[PDB]
Amino acid sequence: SQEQRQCKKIGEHCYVADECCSKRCLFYAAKCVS
Numbered sequence: 001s002q003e004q005r006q007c008k009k010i011g012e013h014c015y016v017a018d019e020c021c022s023k024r025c026l027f028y029a030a031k032c033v034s
Contacts, residue, residue, distance in 0.1 A: 008032050 007021030008014050012032045014025040020032040 010034050 008019060009022060010032045012020065013030060014020045014032060015030065017023045017025040019025055022032050024032045024034065026033060
């Protein structure tokens with residue numbers, strides 16, 4: 001199958017890493033960063 005689900009990609013808002021589907025969130029950046 002092929003499912004397309006995204007929580008928060010690069011450039012999104014998030015308070016923690018868990019909040020970001022990519023797990024690239026930072027307390028300073030507050031946004032998913034590569």
